[PDB]
């Protein structure tokens, strides 16, 4: 990385016409697959289309990581979320969609904080338990350790029992951000720290256009 | 025992308005008033049926009860065509508490639309008034909503003021009916008030946080009381939790400085232990004593049959931190004794505080009964010195005389605190005044008490024969606290040989009669008045009975009609004080 | 005639784990295509190696804080899959269905405190036969490794498989050889202004970790 | 392929014993554990 | 071995780091196809038994290792002790069908009857965890509790009815066993052990002479 406490591991990510640069990077984690599987299937009759305008970052707030929060504090974000972009006008236009996710979580507090976050992409998260949090690293994850990084970048494909999904009744992925070591504000640490997500869908394919009251 | 029952002050309201569901005194700064809660009273508020109102009842002169406007408005809107609140049937006035210039009333069934989805949740609300000021206080109306939050809190179900001017508020529905105690200083309630903000944050707020799911449906804040229990001057928080411990009922006591946890517990299932609580020092040791009510408690009699009578647990606070708990049972079956418990202060001004306990559904025709219990050194005297009876019949909901009551207020400045009793079932409220207590030092001396039949000292006018005589002497001395006449006329009665159809062996000399009466008029606080006279024995050959002692009986009666004052409040003589005393005299052989 | 056959006794009873297939009842069904789905795992121990999971310490936390006193023992526990510290790992939840194991267990120690907090740690292996060590100076005569915090925030130590027999039990019965494989002792050599930090610790399977002889005791 | 400690093969055709797979158009956690960085990362002395 | 702590890259070390040597290992017993190919006992209903694999006890070998994977494929084998004839009906078929003999029906032959059943779901792969739209999650709130609570189960999703191989019906089904053939698994999930009360979960192992 660098010889001193100062840190230079530059990583840039362009989704569409939107970029995102990080200088405290650990690398991108690929989960369960590096590429996609077969988009064209026997269930859409070749009427699937790729919409390239929908593949770009959108931002959202997760939670405040304060010193009083102890091990096991979760924040669950079900994907796809309520989106006001062009990706949102796809769940009102089309009946079936499929896409992967490009998730980048940020927690900025200076390197004089302790504590550790574990951000993980969990498929089909119907229920989590207190003991199951000990095995949360079975999923695509990265740690956010304020002495080393502020960013965790996790790319992940489409998973499901079906090849296309009906996102209005099914949320396949879930972004869970867990406190594994509570925050510390020692003498020079930032008092609290806000956690943000910078998500972007990838390889979005749609099929079956619904009628319009417009 | 000194409460006036002849002509007590009656107050009424609209039928069906539940006039008397809550009562209190209002003493500002120099007229005296009465506060009656009518949670079902119709208001002129725009489109609000039975909003409920609190009435200020003028005690001075006429019996007028002018309503108080805390809120004259209707339902505010969240947006266009989207009501924010539902004041209809909000039961405002279900709980009224006053301290000097500050009047706090609440609406336990006030419903409120969330700032998100369109809901109708009973967070409850209150209105605090400080003379000219009047703000709104809804601590449960917050961002924490829907059952598991403070959505069904019904904040204001019970309220109380501390001595440091801090409000104690109870809400039995918070966190799936775990209940919640909320305490705010009266300073921030008005200082942080904002008419455009529906969820006000108070910087110095004390509250019970949410607990484990096994604590659900316990009803904390069902009733509240204040008093010091850790000996630091600050009033602590006593609250009943009647469904806690699998319907056994509990009572929690928190620190009034930081909401830090004593805990009482019931002995019987579903006896509603904690339905009412009260804190007053009953034994003069300046240590606040805990009173807990359980109206549904069942007792066994000599026939060994269960009968619902009600029970109050008297827990004396020892300096040891422990309690000296005494259980006091009800008297009538299904009367729900212990529904209301009201500290009276020193009702009789004897040196110890007193307390009143009610059986609202007792007495003839389910009218209602209030029992008056006096305090003493050993604790609370378990025998009631007075029994207050309802005088009104039922209509649909029983009269409920005693369902709510308030005391410990000298409203007429007679030196003796009075009592308000609310009978909401008949929409009535009754003020009983305390009559001045007169302690009386009566005396009786017979000398000599050993009579020599052959003494024959005192001559008898009309005859040359002299008789065996002796002296009878009686004394009166009376004094009392508070406002009462400085002159006191009594009616003294004397009987010789009280034990005797039979022949009386002694009679008075200057009358030749065993009976003598004396209109005596003594002064309050003044010296002891004492009039004596000569009685003589009959001749030896006038009776055979020489062994039976001759009992000299003295009895006195006070003129109550002439002792009355202004309104006609007639004083009363102290309890446990003999209205008559008797000495005797023997004959030798 | 026809072919003579001797129907033997003791044969043919249903065995719930026999290498035999049932008879078909219903034919010619074609599955929906599922080639190249993400996340295929063929062996339970492939996931136990690529994915460490947390340990569990006093107070139910995956980290051990830097103590500042004459004591320097952070954790000290039985090298046993049935241990309390190992109880929430995937390696011990997967080993409860087997009666014997063999090979190496990796421990991952990731330091969490700030950039001005510094510490030096020591992990040792006490074989069975005498009591485990109580100070780092007595544990320096074992098999140990020692590291300190810096730019790289994780250190991995491999608990060596020393044993008399080639396999060891995954369960524990009494004080006996096979169920006590010694201890694993974590010490804190030094620290500089590391007061109240955390050293989260993971665990996984080694290269040669093996686990055989399935069994079903109870309690998923 | 699965549970066998014996190899008595099948009377029946594969078309009746199982359900037949179809192709459209050990994978992940075997390549992920095999790409595990095993070697020592420092500058080994002694 | 030092390394970046949060890279999430799998980092293995060996006993060569301090002078050992990694030994060879045989891993046939943790193969997914090998270990899931056992009969596991299922609590049967009286007559009708929809053949879902999530009906297996979760504390069992096959039950606990199946729930350690989000998605799974397998053909099914069934062992049944029943009274009267036993009828099977494929996935997506009406209940009235369980009464008709043309459907695969196995006449009673003591003591039991084992059938090889194919995969008949409309899905390329079945699931142990279904969450249509459920979590916020953010450590879910107490908002629905008490009475509304026991009903509140499905405020989210999870339903294996759709993912059904089929049903069996007999006059009286006494015992039922499942065996997974050709088991494939995807996306592993947590797997927990018994949490001990002592410092170590002791137990009673079989005791020979010495
Ligand atoms: C015979 O008959 C005559 C007339 O009835 C009796 O006369 C009485 O004598 C009493 C003793 O002297 C007298 O007591 C009161 O007056 C006393 C002075 O004369 C005075 O000393 C007393 O105070 C004390 O008295 C009380 C009385 O209870 C004693 O308890 C104390 O110990 C003190 O001694 C009294 O004030 C009484 O008034 C007087 N009565 C009359 C009517 O003359 C006489 O006692 C009789 N004697 C016989 C034979 O018993
Ligand atoms: C001294 C005592 O035990 N205090 C308890 C407190 O711990 C507890 O939360 C509460 C529950 O009702 O009971 C009281
Ligand atoms: C000494 C005398 O005359 N006594 C009378 C008494 O009999 C009467 O009862 C009372 C009425 O107030 O007035 C006096
Ligand atoms: O039962 C464990 C539990 O016991 C009690 C408390 O000390 C809690 O802090 C602790 O988690
Ligand atoms: O859940 C089991 C766990 O619960 C708690 C305590 O009783 C512990 O001793 C116990 O081991
Ligand atoms: Ca106090
Ligand atoms: Ca006391
Ligand atoms: Ca008194
Ligand atoms: Ca008075």
Author numbering:
A (entry chain 2): 5 to 218
B (entry chain A): 1 to 29, 32 to 263, 265 to 503, 506 to 594
C (entry chain 3): 1 to 220
D (entry chain 4): 15 to 39, 65 to 85
E (entry chain 1): 1 to 210
Provide text from the study:
Structures of several serotypes determined at near atomic resolution have revealed a capsid composed of 60 copies each of four structural proteins (VP1 to VP4). A prominent feature of this otherwise rather smooth capsid is an exposed flexible loop (∼30 residues) on VP1, termed the GH loop.
Although the icosahedrally averaged density for the GH loop and integrin displayed little detail, localized reconstruction enabled us to deconvolute distinct modes of integrin attachment, despite the variable occupancy of the integrin2324. For each virus the two well-resolved classes corresponded to distinct poses of the integrin, for PanAsia these were termed A and A′ and for O1M, A and B. The integrin portion for these complexes was resolved at 10.8 Å (pose A, 4.9% of sub-particles) and 11.5 Å (pose A′, 4.2% of sub-particles) for PanAsia and at 8.6 Å (pose A, 5.9% of sub-particles) and 12.3 Å (pose B, 6.7% of sub-particles) for O1M (resolution assessment uses the ‘gold standard' protocol). These modes of interaction demonstrate the extreme flexibility in the presentation of the RGD peptide. The GH-loop is pulled away from the virus surface, raising the RGD peptide by ∼20 Å above its position in the reduced O1BFS virus where the GH loop packs stably on the virus surface.
